[PDB]
């Protein structure tokens, strides 16, 4: 839905947005998986396992959630609330390393590189180079075009 320009990042050095894009693409993958088997009318037991691996993954972390002690109804509510994508919290100077990103991509069915094959909309051909796609959280600023014109 959004097509940016790569040439911005090599000079402006704001390379963190690439990692944000990789995490965003990674985060949606867990959401679709839940959306895959939530729409399939699957028993809550199957969910309890999967979300369990989606929360205990990574290195030693301060997060420690016991999914198997809330309820059945609360787990169903969580599944209905996470079907759009599992949120990820990253502390400013205590964030996640690349290994955690790769491990979370393991949980989904997405390429590890973060670059996937694309198709030109008009010509229907294949771009000769893999292109990075992901979910970026962007803002609309107050400089409305109507006020400036």
């Amino acid at each position: 839905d959004i097509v940016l320009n790569p040439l911005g990042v090599p000079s402006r050095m704001n390379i963190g947005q690439i990692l944000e894009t990789h995490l965003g693409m990674a985060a949606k993958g867990i959401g679709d998986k839940i959306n895959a088997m939530l729409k399939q009318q699957q028993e809550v037991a199957k969910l309890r396992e999967f979300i369990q691996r989606a929360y205990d993954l990574g290195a030693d972390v301060r997060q420690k959630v016991d999914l198997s002690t809330f309820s059945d109804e609360e787990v169903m509510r969580l599944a209905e609330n996470l079907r759009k994508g599992m949120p990820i919290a990253t502390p400013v100077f205590d964030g996640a390393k690349e290994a955690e990103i790769k491990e979370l991509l393991k949980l989904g069915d997405l390429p590890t590189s973060g670059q996937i094959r694309l198709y030109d909309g008009r010509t229907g051909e294949q771009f000769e180079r893999p292109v990075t796609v992901g979910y970026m959280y962007m803002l609309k600023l107050n400089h409305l075009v109507d006020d400036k014109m």
């Binding site: 400089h143 075009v145 109507d146 400036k148 014109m149």
Partner: protein, 100 residues
């Protein structure tokens, strides 16, 4: 107004929003309209163009064809700050500009 990239234009072409184009060239529209006899008085021409009818767009595109406009950023540091272009009528509210 704000700018954007029109990567389908020639070196001597710049885009213009329809609203800005009509606002700028309305005095020329009345002269073009009264010459063709569609309107009668200045009030008649003003109320005719106020409704944005069909003939207004084509007569405006006629008068736009050869009437260069001058574009200049606010800090005109050097000699190329003020340049000229031939307008091309487009939809939107941004000055479509050549990349180069």
């Amino acid at each position: 107004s704000v700018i954007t990239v029109g990567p389908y234009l020639r070196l001597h072409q710049c885009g213009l929003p329809k609203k800005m184009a009509l606002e700028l060239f309305k005095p020329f529209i009345y002269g073009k309209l009264e010459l063709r006899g569609l309107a009668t008085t200045i009030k008649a021409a003003k109320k005719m163009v106020e409704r944005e009818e069909a003939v207004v767009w084509d007569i405006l595109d006629e008068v736009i064809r050869e009437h260069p406009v001058l574009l200049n950023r606010a800090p005109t540091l050097h000699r190329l700050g003020i340049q000229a272009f031939e307008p091309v009528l487009i939809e939107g509210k941004a000055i479509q500009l050549h990349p180069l």
